[PDB]
DNA sequence: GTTATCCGCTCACAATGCCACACGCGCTGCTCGG
DNA sequence: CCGAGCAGCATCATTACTTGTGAGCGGATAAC
């Protein structure tokens, strides 16, 4: 009752979220620095780290 | 009358430019231009017309660091530490940095006057080294530079013509290695 | 007995104490310790029990 | 106060041998380069 | 222009239950 199993699904989404927080920081800073409204919501993210 | 001194903060390997940008941006963010005078990243422009890199080349006084005219206060401190990519305040103990001396500022600014005044091609030459010639008149010959000139820039170079060695006035543009 | 041992007795003093504790060699100020604490817990971003 | 005493805490330092097999081992915006 | 090489990077908090033992050190604790 104190030791839970953890399948491939939960672990996979966890690695997803972990790789996601870093691109979150990056896109936050790029939204901060760069022009607020001159862009399409299509490149401020970089999916390569994901 | 708060006199903003000059401090130095460690940048990263290849980040210095955007670091200075983001710094000015965050200054504008908190509107603290009164506390942050100027972010100085000294550089150098060595100019060679050929040899791979051509017509210019950009060096820096010293990498990894950025120079600021901040004023000392914890607010400004975190304002510089709440930026994307920097290390701590290069200096004495952390949370109590060491402003660089005024003599340092004066010397560095004399350095900047010197470098920005004359575009000085580095990777210079020394009297006594041997070197070939990639130019039509003396293709792939090789002699020794007996005198180096900068303004005239014409490489007094002793080379073997008609038996007896003799000086030649070929320009930098045709020198080989070294 | 613990309160006898307790070095500080003031709230902001407590925050600067824990601020030094978690990460020494850094400027103990009010806002910095407060941010460190209320983002060590109470932060849906940097924390989630489950 | 001194003076040494001991103690809590910190940090270093050890983890069977083989095998076999498998898998994998820079990057990332600067640099250069034409 | 745009592909191929490249130069020094904690790449914030990146955390991290013990393993068991020994030695040493900063500081509490007591004798003179």
UniProtKB/Swiss-Prot annotation, chain C:
It comes from the Bacteria. Coiled coil: none annotated. Belongs to the RNA polymerase beta chain family. The RNAP catalytic core consists of 2 alpha, 1 beta, 1 beta' and 1 omega subunit. When a sigma factor is associated with the core the holoenzyme is formed, which can initiate transcription. DNA-dependent RNA polymerase catalyzes the transcription of DNA into RNA using the four ribonucleoside triphosphates as substrates. This is DNA-directed RNA polymerase subunit beta. It comes from Escherichia coli O157:H7. The gene is rpoB.
């Amino acid at each position: 009752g104190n030791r839970r199993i953890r399948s491939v699904g939960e672990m996979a989404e966890n690695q997803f979220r972990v790789g996601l927080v870093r691109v979150e920081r990056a896109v936050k800073e790029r939204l901060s620095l760069g022009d607020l409204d001159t862009l399409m919501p299509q490149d401020m993210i970089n999916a390569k780290p994901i | 009358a708060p006199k903003k001194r000059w401090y130095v903060v460690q940048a990263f390997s290849g980040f210095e430019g955007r670091v200075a940008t983001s710094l000015r941006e965050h200054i504008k963010l908190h509107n603290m231009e009164d506390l942050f005078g100027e972010v100085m990243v000294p550089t150098e422009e060595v100019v060679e017309i050929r040899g791979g890199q051509r017509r210019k080349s950009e060096r820096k006084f010293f990498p990894g660091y950025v120079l600021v005219q901040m004023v000392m206060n914890d607010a400004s401190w975190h304002l510089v530490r709440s930026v994307p990519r920097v290390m701590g305040f290069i200096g004495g103990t952390s949370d109590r940095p060491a402003p660089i001396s005024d003599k340092e500022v004066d010397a560095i600014m004399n350095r900047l006057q010197q470098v920005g005044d004359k575009p000085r091609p580095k990777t210079l030459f020394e009297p006594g080294e041997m070197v070939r010639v990639n130019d039509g008149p003396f293709a792939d010959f090789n002699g020794v530079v007996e005198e180096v000139d900068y303004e005239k820039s014409r490489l007094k170079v002793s080379v073997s013509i008609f038996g007896r060695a003799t000086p030649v006035e070929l320009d930098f543009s045709q020198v080989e290695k070294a | 007995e613990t309160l006898r041992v307790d070095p500080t007795n003031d709230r902001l003093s407590a925050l600067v104490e824990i601020y030094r504790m978690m990460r020494p060699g850094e400027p103990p100020t009010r806002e910095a310790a407060e941010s460190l604490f209320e983002n060590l817990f109470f932060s849906e971003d940097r924390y989630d029990l489950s």
